[PDB]
Ligand binder design. Sequence first.
Ligand SMILES: CC[C@H](O)[C@@H]1N(C(=O)OC)[C@H]2CC[C@]1(O)CC2
Length: 281
Amino acid sequence: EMEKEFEQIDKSGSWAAIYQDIRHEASDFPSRVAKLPKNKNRNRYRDVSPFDHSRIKLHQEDNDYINASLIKMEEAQRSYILTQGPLPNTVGHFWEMVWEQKSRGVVMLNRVMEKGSLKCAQYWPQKEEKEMIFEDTNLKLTLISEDIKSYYTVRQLELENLTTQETREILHFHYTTWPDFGVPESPASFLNFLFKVRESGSLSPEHGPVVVHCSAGIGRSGTFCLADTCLLLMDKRKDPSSVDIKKVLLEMRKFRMGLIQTADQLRFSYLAVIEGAKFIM
Ligand SMILES: CC[C@H](O)[C@@H]1N(C(=O)OC)[C@H]2CC[C@]1(O)CC2
């Protein structure tokens, strides 16, 4: 059981050690499309690339590339799109992806400014009456409503395909209180946020995959989909002993590199799953 494995790693201080074995066992697949010179300004970080095999393709004939990966968890019957925080020049591609993949939710785990630098473009409207038009992808985005809570904000957005005049409602789940350094001291507010995403239906098989991002789309974003998948598997098996968080993480790392960036995020992922287990057992 992971609770006992947790105490062992914690009492032995072996987190940096466990984390390194994960790094060494992780899949390495080609990312040729990400490294083409025409895509250099579509990537926020030169060392974070989607694998070719799992990359999301845009349906535009010109350039189909976006720094996004499809993570398909077969036994949990859950899919996720993990992406980077959009750049000034990829905000239209971001919303095009949301449209094309029939996503109902966007999960954002960063602030636009962290450690005095920009981690993401402002890619949604701040006021109802000031909608955004993405001329490159022919989309319009309107803020419908905003609910600001202590640890996160939920926004109701309307996305309109200006080409066909179809509209959809997108839910934006913005976790606003992830610390500039380390990890949230308790997983309580993170679990409350995750259940709020679940309750919305954004993670349900009747919709396209949820879009999840932070700045790179590997660290905080990894913690979110690792906790969700582990808790779902514990329900499907109704046994918190058959589920190995290290095996789940390695399976997710076949789809996008680098998921879970620090030994701290790994320890936090354990704590989140152990605590969430109480509310599902
Ligand atoms: C709980 C679902 C989600 O939060 C949505 N919303 C919202 O912005 O948060 C309260 C309103 C209540 C139901 C909505 O689906 C639509 C309007």
